[PDB]
């Protein structure tokens, strides 16, 4: 169904406001709400949101409260001031999946047959991206295990509108940025790449401990996937691949040589202009 | 578990409470013992402003802490 | 007497909603209602704002349902927002920022109902990526001012940092009211978000550009260099042959080959460097 | 004044760091620095706190402190940073 | 006295150093 | 009788009225009390609008009921 | 080995670690000693703020080094 989802900044600021406000009604560690949006050509666009009361008794699953006829009432009250937008899905601000949210989803799906989940973690502890997108599917099994009802991943991004990025930029007076050109490349696409890749490999590293009797091998599936990973990775950089590499490095650098030469000649020319102009005018004004 | 409250008048009020109580409850106790409406009371504890929906042990208030009441006056 | 220094703190969310709502009623003075609290004699803080059902005719607007307002407000309390009304706002496209005629009248009744009210006016069509045009006003006293009394007290430089524009003087700002300074006060968590708001995934950084197509671009620019070198030789030859400014003044049509020559560097460089570096790294980090 | 005091600086930076009125901060931003006086290197820890703060008025009061901590010394190590902030 | 001269020059050097650093920083920041 | 009418500001007003009074008389009393003109203010009760043409008994306004006042919002 | 960490009030702590020790163990043991929640803190040495994944040896930390603890005093 859905191929990608796009989020506008107004939603993210709304989430954060809700998270800070709840302290006046409870003590819970999570909050839940509704996403208003629209979509076309399997590209989904979320634009606006409001938050509805929710509560959960932490020490168990299966004991939670979610207020229907407040949701229906608000949806009515909003529709009266913008006809463009319709229920699309829901969000919660927990850092990690919870046991019961599939059972939340099977409720709120009665308001929209395609409903999508967005996790918006409000306290990042890393370099990263603040949103994740999930859709619900049924899984068969080869083990003869009964059919399982389970989430599936969807790629996500932030989008923008000209009427908002004016505000975002008026507000982004906080720190440095835009170390132009060659300065920004290597930071943005080498260092902050390698840090991510490292964190991922540490995560796999940790999981393969628990299998030391701490937990049951979750499936041979995950092991088959790992074997694909270590099989695919590029062949040892030892064959005539090396020849093909040197060729392009020569060609890549030669034109650099040319450009650098151009770069120097202009400096000499500017030098001469500065020199003559100086001395002449000096003797003249003397 | 004793608590001292200071009002603008400087009168001191003593409270026997529990670390898992809530600000709503202590505001109500004050309402009972002095007659001030609960919702006019705002609680001050050093700089922090205390919020009704959560519990004293979340602010780790200790024994015999001194705690200020402020009145949000209303227009008229 | 009102102190010159008193601020209005608006809370970043409210501003974004004011814009995305103003830049829609493109040629019409859309309006709305604004919620906050009076922290102190030197402050007012606005925390949120919401629209209404309303209709107009280009020359005017007004809202039609009064019940909707009380119902929405009384609903919001059930989720931690007990704050009440402190003011209102409306958008002026392209005019500038001031209060005029009717806007004073609907304003002044607020002040009979609640002193210390505030009226805000924003302009969404002059604004641009660097800066947004906002103003906040309150009415001068209903005269009895032949006494020559100042409207406000002063005990700081803090209120005289800014120059009033000619337009508001035309419509009389210091004659009928006065401006109040806007200030922003972001908290920790939202500003932590606001910087993430542009980060892009690690997946991309390690990726190579195609080597074909890349070579094509290299050959394109190198063959573009020729004509500029040829022109540059003449441009060197001919200078100082006439009066100095009459170089530039006679070079408004035809381009000057120095700049176009120079700015084809910073395209061979940058590109070739970063591609060779990225390949050179990832040849190690995978096997 | 000038008698550095382990306790009072906490009893006032804690209050300044968590109150909503502005005038209180515009008073304390001076009130802190006078607890250092010529103490040369001793105060440097406090300095590195305040200059890192998000809050603009505390970030300011860092500067008054590094002025009152080094009166007359002419020490280059204070200039090199106290001027870098301006730029 | 040669000594005082020596010391004066010595310090002068350092002052020059810091001034050079500051103006370098300024030249980089005005572009942004 | 006594009647309580409260506004979007959080200020509240108490009026004295007799059941035969019309809405217009209410608004006139409000203007006397505060200076808002009678044409600007809208009234609400039990979630439906008030209108002139009727006595206060007619809507079954009981002792110590609560009314909402909301202002005309015009700009141009 | 013995390392020094300074807090703003002029408190100093001396602490036992190893060259291969990681930042996380340092924060953990400072928690165990003083009770500071591990997240509310930042460690500064050489004018830089450290990264939680590296070792002390990665920053060329040497014997009897002193580093500054930065603290959000009351957390909230």
PDB file of C-alpha atoms in Angstrom, chain D residues 76 79-80 83-84 86-87, chain E residues 14-15 18 22 25-26 29:
ATOM      1  CA  UNK D  76      46.641  36.785  28.155  1.00  0.00           C
ATOM      2  CA  UNK D  79      41.832  37.980  26.870  1.00  0.00           C
ATOM      3  CA  UNK D  80      42.104  35.167  24.366  1.00  0.00           C
ATOM      4  CA  UNK D  83      37.368  38.677  23.172  1.00  0.00           C
ATOM      5  CA  UNK D  84      36.494  35.599  21.123  1.00  0.00           C
ATOM      6  CA  UNK D  86      32.450  39.284  20.971  1.00  0.00           C
ATOM      7  CA  UNK D  87      33.164  38.094  17.445  1.00  0.00           C
TER       8      UNK D  87
ATOM      9  CA  UNK E  14      52.779  37.711  22.922  1.00  0.00           C
ATOM     10  CA  UNK E  15      50.393  40.624  22.582  1.00  0.00           C
ATOM     11  CA  UNK E  18      46.814  37.212  20.400  1.00  0.00           C
ATOM     12  CA  UNK E  22      41.539  37.448  16.968  1.00  0.00           C
ATOM     13  CA  UNK E  25      38.660  34.667  13.693  1.00  0.00           C
ATOM     14  CA  UNK E  26      36.879  37.879  12.713  1.00  0.00           C
ATOM     15  CA  UNK E  29      33.052  34.976  10.818  1.00  0.00           C
TER      16      UNK E  29
END
